[PDB]
Coordinates of N, CA and C in Angstrom, one line a residue:
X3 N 192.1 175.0 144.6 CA 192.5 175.3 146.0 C 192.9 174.1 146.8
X4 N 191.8 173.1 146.5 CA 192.3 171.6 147.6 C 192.9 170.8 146.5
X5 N 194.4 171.3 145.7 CA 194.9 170.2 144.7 C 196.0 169.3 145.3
X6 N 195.4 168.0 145.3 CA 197.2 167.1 145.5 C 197.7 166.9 144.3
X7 N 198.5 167.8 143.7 CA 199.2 167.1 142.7 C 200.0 166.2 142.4
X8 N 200.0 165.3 141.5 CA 200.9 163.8 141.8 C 201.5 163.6 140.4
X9 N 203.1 163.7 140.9 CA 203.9 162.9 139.4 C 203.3 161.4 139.0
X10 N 203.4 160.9 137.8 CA 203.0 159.9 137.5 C 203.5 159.0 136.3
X11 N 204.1 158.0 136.7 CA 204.5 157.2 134.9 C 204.1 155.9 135.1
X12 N 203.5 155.4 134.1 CA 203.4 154.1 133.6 C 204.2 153.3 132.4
X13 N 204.4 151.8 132.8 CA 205.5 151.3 131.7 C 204.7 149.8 131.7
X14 N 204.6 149.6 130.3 CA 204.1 148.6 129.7 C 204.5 147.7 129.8
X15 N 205.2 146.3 130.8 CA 205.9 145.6 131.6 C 206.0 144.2 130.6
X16 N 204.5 144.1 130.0 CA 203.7 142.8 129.3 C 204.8 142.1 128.8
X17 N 205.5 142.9 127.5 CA 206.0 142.1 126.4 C 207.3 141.9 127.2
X18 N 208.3 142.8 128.2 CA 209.3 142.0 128.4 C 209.4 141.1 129.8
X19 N 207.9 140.7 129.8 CA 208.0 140.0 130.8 C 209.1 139.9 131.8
X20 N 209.3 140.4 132.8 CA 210.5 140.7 133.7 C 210.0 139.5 135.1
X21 N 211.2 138.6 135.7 CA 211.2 138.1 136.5 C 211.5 138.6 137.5
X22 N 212.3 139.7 137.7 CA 211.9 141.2 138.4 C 212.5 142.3 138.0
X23 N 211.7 142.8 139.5 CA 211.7 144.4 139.1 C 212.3 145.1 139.9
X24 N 212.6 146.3 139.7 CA 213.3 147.0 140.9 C 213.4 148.6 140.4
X25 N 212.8 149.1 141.8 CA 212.1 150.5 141.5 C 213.5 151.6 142.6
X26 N 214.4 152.5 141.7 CA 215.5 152.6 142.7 C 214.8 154.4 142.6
X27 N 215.3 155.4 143.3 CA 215.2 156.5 143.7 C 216.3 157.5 144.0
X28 N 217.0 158.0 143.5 CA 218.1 158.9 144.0 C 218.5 160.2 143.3
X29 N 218.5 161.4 143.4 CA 219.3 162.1 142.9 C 218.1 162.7 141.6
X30 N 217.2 163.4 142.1 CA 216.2 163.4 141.2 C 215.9 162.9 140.4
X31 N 215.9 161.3 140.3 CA 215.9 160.6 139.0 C 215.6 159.1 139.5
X32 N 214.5 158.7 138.9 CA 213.6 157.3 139.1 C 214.0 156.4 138.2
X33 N 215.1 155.5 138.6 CA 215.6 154.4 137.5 C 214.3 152.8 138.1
X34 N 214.1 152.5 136.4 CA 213.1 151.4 136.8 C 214.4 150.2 135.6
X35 N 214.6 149.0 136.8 CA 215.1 148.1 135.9 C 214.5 146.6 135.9
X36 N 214.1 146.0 134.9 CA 213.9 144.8 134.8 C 214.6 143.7 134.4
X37 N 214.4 142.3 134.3 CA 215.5 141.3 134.3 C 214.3 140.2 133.9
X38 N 214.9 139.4 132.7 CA 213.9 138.2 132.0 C 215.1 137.1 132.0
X39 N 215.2 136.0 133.0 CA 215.7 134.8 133.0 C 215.8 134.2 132.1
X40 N 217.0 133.8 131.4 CA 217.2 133.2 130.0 C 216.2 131.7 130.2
X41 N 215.5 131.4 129.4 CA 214.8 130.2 129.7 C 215.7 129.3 128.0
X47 N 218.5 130.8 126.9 CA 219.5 131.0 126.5 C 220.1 132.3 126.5
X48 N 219.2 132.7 126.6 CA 219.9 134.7 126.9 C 219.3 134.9 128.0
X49 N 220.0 136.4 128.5 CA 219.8 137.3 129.6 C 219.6 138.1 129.1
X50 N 218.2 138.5 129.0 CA 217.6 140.0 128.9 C 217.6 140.9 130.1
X51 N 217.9 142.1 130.1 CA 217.7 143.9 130.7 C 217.1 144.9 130.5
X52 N 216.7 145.4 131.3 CA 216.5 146.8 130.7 C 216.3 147.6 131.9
X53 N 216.1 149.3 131.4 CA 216.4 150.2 132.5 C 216.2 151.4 131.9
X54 N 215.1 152.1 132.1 CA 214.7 153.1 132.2 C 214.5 154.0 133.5
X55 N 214.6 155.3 132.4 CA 215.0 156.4 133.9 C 214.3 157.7 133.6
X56 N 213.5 158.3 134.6 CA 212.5 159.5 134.3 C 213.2 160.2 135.6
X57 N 213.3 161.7 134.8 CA 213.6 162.9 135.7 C 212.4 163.2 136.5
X58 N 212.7 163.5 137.9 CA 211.8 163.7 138.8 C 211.2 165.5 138.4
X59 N 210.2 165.5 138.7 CA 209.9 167.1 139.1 C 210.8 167.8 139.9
X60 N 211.2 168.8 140.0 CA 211.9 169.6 141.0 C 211.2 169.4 142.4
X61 N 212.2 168.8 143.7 CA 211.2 169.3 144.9 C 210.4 167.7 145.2
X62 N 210.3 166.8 144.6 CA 210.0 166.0 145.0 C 210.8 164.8 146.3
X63 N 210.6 164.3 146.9 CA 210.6 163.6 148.2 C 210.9 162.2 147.3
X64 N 212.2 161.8 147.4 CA 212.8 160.5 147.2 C 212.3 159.2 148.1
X65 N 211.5 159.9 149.1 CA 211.4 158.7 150.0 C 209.7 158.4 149.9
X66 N 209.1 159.7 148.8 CA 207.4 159.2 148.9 C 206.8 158.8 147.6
X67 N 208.8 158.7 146.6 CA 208.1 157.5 145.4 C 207.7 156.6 145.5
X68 N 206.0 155.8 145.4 CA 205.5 154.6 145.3 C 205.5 153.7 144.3
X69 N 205.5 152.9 144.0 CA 205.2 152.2 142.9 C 204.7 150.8 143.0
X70 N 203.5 150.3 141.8 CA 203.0 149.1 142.1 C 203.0 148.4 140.6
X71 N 202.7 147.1 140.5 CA 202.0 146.3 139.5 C 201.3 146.0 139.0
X72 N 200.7 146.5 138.2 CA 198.7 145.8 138.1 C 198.7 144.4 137.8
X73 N 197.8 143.7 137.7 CA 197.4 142.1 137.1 C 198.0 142.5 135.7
X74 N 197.6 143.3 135.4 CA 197.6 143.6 133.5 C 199.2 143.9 133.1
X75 N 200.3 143.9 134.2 CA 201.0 144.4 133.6 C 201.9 145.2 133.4
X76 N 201.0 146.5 134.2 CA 201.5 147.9 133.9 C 202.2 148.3 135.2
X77 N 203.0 148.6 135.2 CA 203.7 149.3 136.3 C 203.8 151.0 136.7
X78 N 203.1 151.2 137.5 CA 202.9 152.6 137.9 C 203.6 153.3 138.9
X79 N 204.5 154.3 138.6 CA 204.8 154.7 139.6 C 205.0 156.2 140.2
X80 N 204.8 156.8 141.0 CA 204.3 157.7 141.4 C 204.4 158.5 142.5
X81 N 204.5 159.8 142.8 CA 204.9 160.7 143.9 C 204.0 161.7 143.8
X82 N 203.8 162.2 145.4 CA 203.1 163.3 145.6 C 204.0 165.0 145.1
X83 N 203.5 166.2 144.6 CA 203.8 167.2 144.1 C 204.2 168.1 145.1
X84 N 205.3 168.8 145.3 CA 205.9 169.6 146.7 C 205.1 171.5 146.5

């Protein structure tokens, strides 16, 4: 009866170490892309999760833990 349901994904950030990050939102779909400063190459990457139906583009959060992990997350409509 009192449920807040919440979308939720996590991404294992560790191994490609990303100098940043960038959490974009549009069009039912949560693109997460990262970027590792050549210390001789330019590494990328870019992952993309389909939203739930009905979700609010503007109340995807997302954070970093110490550990790593990147969480990101929306309340359920």
């Amino acid at each position: 009866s009192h449920t807040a349901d919440r979308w939720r994904v996590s991404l294992d950030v560790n191994h490609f170490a990303p100098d940043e990050l960038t959490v974009k939102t549009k069009d039912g779909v949560v693109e997460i892309t990262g970027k590792h400063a050549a210390r001789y190459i330019s590494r990328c990457f870019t992952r993309k999760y389909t939203l739930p139906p009905g979700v609010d583009p503007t109340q995807v959060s997302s954070s970093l833990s110490p550990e790593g992990t990147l969480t990101v997350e929306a309340p359920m409509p």
